[PDB]
Amino acid sequence: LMQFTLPVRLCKEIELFHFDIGPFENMWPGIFVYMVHRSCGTSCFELEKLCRFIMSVKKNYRRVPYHNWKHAVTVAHCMYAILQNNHTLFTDLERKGLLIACLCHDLDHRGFSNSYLQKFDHPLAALYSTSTMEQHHFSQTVSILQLEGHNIFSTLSSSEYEQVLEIIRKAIIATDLALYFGNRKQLEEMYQTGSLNLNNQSHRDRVIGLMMTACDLCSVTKLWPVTKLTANDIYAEFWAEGDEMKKLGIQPIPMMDRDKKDEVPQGQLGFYNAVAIPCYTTLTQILPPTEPLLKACRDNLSQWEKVIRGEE
Numbered sequence: 001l002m003q004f005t006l007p008v009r010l011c012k013e014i015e016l017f018h019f020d021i022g023p024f025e026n027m028w029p030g031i032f033v034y035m036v037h038r039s040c041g042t043s044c045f046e047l048e049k050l051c052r053f054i055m056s057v058k059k060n061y062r063r064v065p066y067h068n069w070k071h072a073v074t075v076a077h078c079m080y081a082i083l084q085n086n087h088t089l090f091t092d093l094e095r096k097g098l099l100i101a102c103l104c105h106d107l108d109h110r111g112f113s114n115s116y117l118q119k120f121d122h123p124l125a126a127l128y129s130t131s132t133m134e135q136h137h138f139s140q141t142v143s144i145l146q147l148e149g150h151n152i153f154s155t156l157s158s159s160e161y162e163q164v165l166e167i168i169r170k171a172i173i174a175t176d177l178a179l180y181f182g183n184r185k186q187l188e189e190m191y192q193t194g195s196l197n198l199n200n201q202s203h204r205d206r207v208i209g210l211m212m213t214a215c216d217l218c219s220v221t222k223l224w225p226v227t228k229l230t231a232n233d234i235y236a237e238f239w240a241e242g243d244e245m246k247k248l249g250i251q252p253i254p255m256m257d258r259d260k261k262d263e264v265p266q267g268q269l270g271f272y273n274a275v276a277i278p279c280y281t282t283l284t285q286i287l288p289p290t291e292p293l294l295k296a297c298r299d300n301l302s303q304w305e306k307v308i309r310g311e312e
């Protein structure tokens with residue numbers, strides 16, 4: 001067999017949750033295949049179909065500051081670290097489906113929120129009334145799978161193919177942050193009443209949802225230097241959308257106004273307290289080995305406070 005291998009430093013550090021995939025774009029496909037081979041197995045996919053699929057997915061990500069091919073692979077690596085540390089809890093189909101779900105989860109992102117597409121009156125908002133971009137991302141995933149020689153699931157039966165596509169669809173739709181607030185609340189009550197049951201499919205669906213949120217936001221779980229630089233990338237997108245909202249004659253929300261630039265540290269504080277810490281807290285309750293994500297999130301929250309007090 002031709003096994004995929006990484007340089008020594010990458011081979012060791014890829015197992016850490018806070019791993020950064022680096023600036024060499026041409027290594028990212030090899031990094032993804034390595035993760036698939038180790039978390040799924042070397043017989044999950046035909047290597048030639050998987051490589052053709054990877055390159056079609058890369059080509060349908062756009063050159064935007066944050067919602068780009070690097071984000072896709074970074075999110076898949078977070079999912080890799082969760083699966084390797086909880087390797088008894090997931091099925092064959094779930095392992096196959098979830099790494100692909102993560103690679104495809106922001107396909108053809110234009111750097112604009114669902115709100116902007118609705119205010120602009122974009123055709124996609126007419127086609128998909130809720131979770132607009134997320135239904136588009138999944139539609140792009142299915143288009144790519146249906147290209148000649150791109151069916152990486154061609155050995156599965158009809159019923160198995162239908163199950164894995166249904167895992168991918170739910171996982172991608174769950175990356176809509178508007179849905180996360182209700183999903184984490186339900187998982188929080190379910191956990192505290194002792195009713196959460198990982199054999200209940202509708203409960204698995206909620207846990208995979210939260211895992212997809214945790215993977216999608218994993219830029220706040222990196223070492224401070226990575227997290228700080230990545231914050232510049234998301235704001236570059238937010239501020240461009242704010243400019244576009246002003247052009248429609250609409251006042252943008254504060255996180256999208258480039259004039260409120262000096263309030264970024266306080267904005268981050270609110271984001272960590274309202275969104276990220278609760279996300280990684282509930283996830284650590286359900287999947288205790290995902291502790292290092294919560295720990296690294298708390299450390300970054302402390303760094304932003306040190307910024308606000310004018311020490312950083």
Ligand SMILES: Cn1cc(C(=O)Nc2cccc(-c3cn4ccccc4n3)c2)c(Nc2cncnc2)n1
Nearest residue numbers: 219220227230231234254255260263264267268271
């Ligand atoms: C997907 N995603 C969303 C956020 C995020 O920060 N959202 C957010 C949420 C709530 C409030 C504010 C907020 C209010 N404000 C008021 C004035 C100025 C600024 C400001 N920001 C921002 C994010 N960040 C991030 C950070 N570091 C690395 N990767 C990603 N990634």
Ligand SMILES: [Cl-]
Nearest residue numbers: 023024025026
């Ligand atoms: Cl390169």
Ligand SMILES: [Cl-]
Nearest residue numbers: 061062063064
């Ligand atoms: Cl482009």
Ligand SMILES: [Cl-]
Nearest residue numbers: 148149150151
């Ligand atoms: Cl085929």
Ligand SMILES: [Mg+2]
Nearest residue numbers: 105106175176
């Ligand atoms: Mg998205």
Ligand SMILES: [Zn+2]
Nearest residue numbers: 071105106216
């Ligand atoms: Zn994303």
